[PDB]
Amino acid sequence: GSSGSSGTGEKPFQCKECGMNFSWSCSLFKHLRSHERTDPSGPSSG
Ligand SMILES: [Zn+2]
């Protein structure tokens, strides 16, 4: 299976719609709207 982690990169904030991560806090919100206005057309992320 997927066995290979090249480099390390974690994130404090994360999207609860698609999983998109964002360094800042507010930033995420600016992206979250993408779901508040338009629908992803179903569960994009498991
Ligand atoms: Zn998202």
Curated annotation (Swiss-Prot):
It is found in: Nucleus. Signal peptide: none annotated. A zinc finger (C2H2-type) spans 13-35. It comes from the Eukaryota. May be involved in transcriptional regulation. Belongs to the krueppel C2H2-type zinc-finger protein family. This is Zinc finger protein with KRAB and SCAN domains 5. The gene is ZKSCAN5.
